[PDB]
Structure formats: structure tokens, C-alpha cells
Design a binder for this molecule. Structure first.
Ligand SMILES: Nc1ncnc2c1ncn2[C@@H]1O[C@@H]2COP(=O)(O)OP(=O)(O)OC[C@H]3O[C@@H](O[C@@H]1[C@@H]2O)[C@H](O)[C@@H]3O
Ligand SMILES: Nc1ncnc2c1ncn2[C@@H]1O[C@@H]2COP(=O)(O)OP(=O)(O)OC[C@H]3O[C@@H](O[C@@H]1[C@@H]2O)[C@H](O)[C@@H]3O
Lengths: 76, 76, 86, 86
């Protein structure tokens, strides 16, 4: 379906994405902007989060398989 | 000096760590707890951040070299 | 000059990409597909494997001239300063 | 049962570790040190390399019985449910 580059633009626009090939069920990613994160100092940058399979919110770490996969989809 | 497992316990205690082998200068990590992040719903988990070389705050992604390295140190 | 998604297309075509915003110098990524690994280590039998054991691996030629498995950071994934090694 | 730092000690000793909290089944990590890679691909000359080109690589035996380069997630790094493959 969707590539990771396409899934990123969906994330940069505020929607939630996921991979059908993931082992965990009901997981998704969402991107929070630097302005929303604050709510010559260093400023925040965009951060991708992950809602895990056990209903927990962590900072997301992409696997090599995630980045190369073609099975991304939008959370409906 | 310090291993990554030792550097993690320093992070879990609120201090800042870094690797001397990193290419970027003046970078460090810090861990924010789930309680501090909020400020059958999914709850936050601990998140490791990184102050980058260009004074930006991102979610940290460990390289394989980071995890196996022995050159960790505490920010003084 | 290009995003990470565009750099992935360049990576999947056997080319090398890099970020000008990286701290280290003379670094680049390259992709070893499952078929490339099966062929390079297959001794002429790789075309008959159908299901190789090694998945796709992205490598990074680091600043120390070593070769590591590349871990995509959120800064790299969200960056817009990717380019092709010329 | 053990933390990630303890699992790293087990990894650096040639043993395999895993997380009971992982979603996939029958998965484990294993480490290929720089010396192991230089020896296994060196054809009896690996002891004379001094500075090998390949760094240490952590691999993951994934649920599909494939072998990938393992990317340490923040959940894995902070987890406390690591154990040794028996
Ligand atoms: N010896 C090595 N082995 C494996 N990978 C390496 C590496 N050296 C650099 N990388 C990676 O290659 C890209 C550019 O690296 P650099 O930006 O030039 O250096 P630095 O940012 O200071 O590394 C610190 C942070 O960068 C991130 O990984 C970087 C980054 O994705 C990661 O989060 C790390 O904690
Ligand atoms: N085919 C594969 N190739 C490479 N690595 C793979 C993999 N399958 C799983 N992994 C990794 O191995 C550990 C346990 O994996 P699982 O927990 O059993 O599955 P899942 O969490 O749903 O993967 C989704 C998220 O897990 C994270 O990576 C996982 C996780 O570190 C990563 O952030 C990913 O976005």
C-alpha cells in the first residue's frame, strides 16, 4: 500500500499511520510539532510517538524494515 | 569509562549523559518521566530525549554503536 | 535537497545517500537487498533460494571508515537535507 | 528478569537474549563482534587484520525466521523483562 515516505507526509499533516506487518495489534504513530511540545535556548523539534500494544505512549524508533516497508496505512 | 547500562541508570535518576565518541559537540541525553510528560486511556512511558548539536530537542534513537559503547560519561 | 522518502527511492536503486546536516564527514548509506545478499553469499545458487534468511540491511559508512548497520534516527527520518553521493 | 544493561553483558558473551514483552514470538538477539566478523569472513587471515572494516553488528532473529539488523527501540532499552534464550 503506502511507502514510508508517503506515511511521513501523512504524519506531518496530523494523521495516524501504522504497518500491517507489525506483530503488535492496535498500534499507530503520530507526530507532535515543536510548538505543541513546549506546552538562545534550545527549541523542540518534531517528535514521532508510538501508541504501543499495551496502551502506552513512547518515542518511536524506526526499524530498518519499517523504513523500507510498503505496507503502511492510515488509521481510519 | 561508563557502559550504556550504567548510563541508563544515570538517566533514570535525572542526570544527563553523552558519548565522547560522538561526532557532534555539546550533545547530551535526558529522560523525562511519564508524569512529567503529561504536563482506560493510554498513559505515557519514559522518553529519552537528545539535545542535538544545533540546539534542538528530539526523541533519541540509539545506534548499535551507542548501545555497545564503553565511552559514556555524565554531563558535569 | 530531497526528503527521506526520496532518498529511500535512491537507496532502493543501488545508489548512496547522505545528509549534509550530519556531524560526521564523508559518511553515506547504502542498501543491501535480500536478493543482493542471497546472491553475493550464494556462490551461484542465490537465484534458487526463493526465501532468503537475510532481510534487507541498510549499512552506514561511518566517519571512521568502518561499516555499521544504520539505525534511522528521528532527525534523519524527518530531515530534508538528503542528497546523492556524486 | 534482567535489565537491558545486563542483557548487553550476556550479548557480549556470545549468548542470545530476548524480551518476554515483545509482540512477536520465538525472537532473539545475537551479537556479531568485529573480531567474529573478521574471522568468519577472513578465510584464516582474520587474526592479522588489526583494524577490520565491519563494526559490531546486533542481529535480530525475527518472527518470520528472517535475520535483520536490530534497531534498539526506547521501549526495549528501558524495559526490565530481558532473559537468556535457554
Ligand atoms: N559509529 C556509528 N555507528 C553507527 N551509526 C552511527 C555512527 N556514527 C554516527 N552514526 C549515525 O549516523 C548518522 C549521522 O551521524 P553523525 O550525525 O555524523 O554523528 P552523531 O549525530 O553525533 O551521532 C550520535 C547520534 O546520531 C545517531 O546516529 C548517527 C546518525 O543517524 C544516533 O542517534 C546517535 O546517538
Ligand atoms: N521484521 C523486523 N525487522 C527488524 N526489526 C523488527 C522486526 N520486527 C520486530 N522488530 C523489532 O524487534 C523488537 C520486537 O518486535 P515486536 O515487538 O515483536 O513487534 P512490533 O513491536 O509490533 O514492531 C514494531 C516496532 O517494534 C520495533 O522494532 C521491533 C522491536 O524492537 C520498532 O520500533 C517497530 O516500529
Amino acid at each position: 500500500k503506502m511507502s514510508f515516505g508517503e506515511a511521513l507526509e501523512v504524519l506531518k499533516q496530523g494523521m495516524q499511520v501504522y504497518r500491517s506487518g507489525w506483530n503488535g495489534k492496535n498500534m499507530f504513530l503520530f507526530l507532535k510539532s515543536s510548538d505543541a511540545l513546549a506546552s538562545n535556548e534550545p527549541v523542540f523539534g518534531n517528535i514521532i510517538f508510538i501508541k504501543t500494544a499495551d496502551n502506552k505512549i513512547h518515542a518511536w524508533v524506526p526499524s530498518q524494515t519499517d523504513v523500507l516497508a510498503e505496507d503502511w496505512d492510515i488509521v481510519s
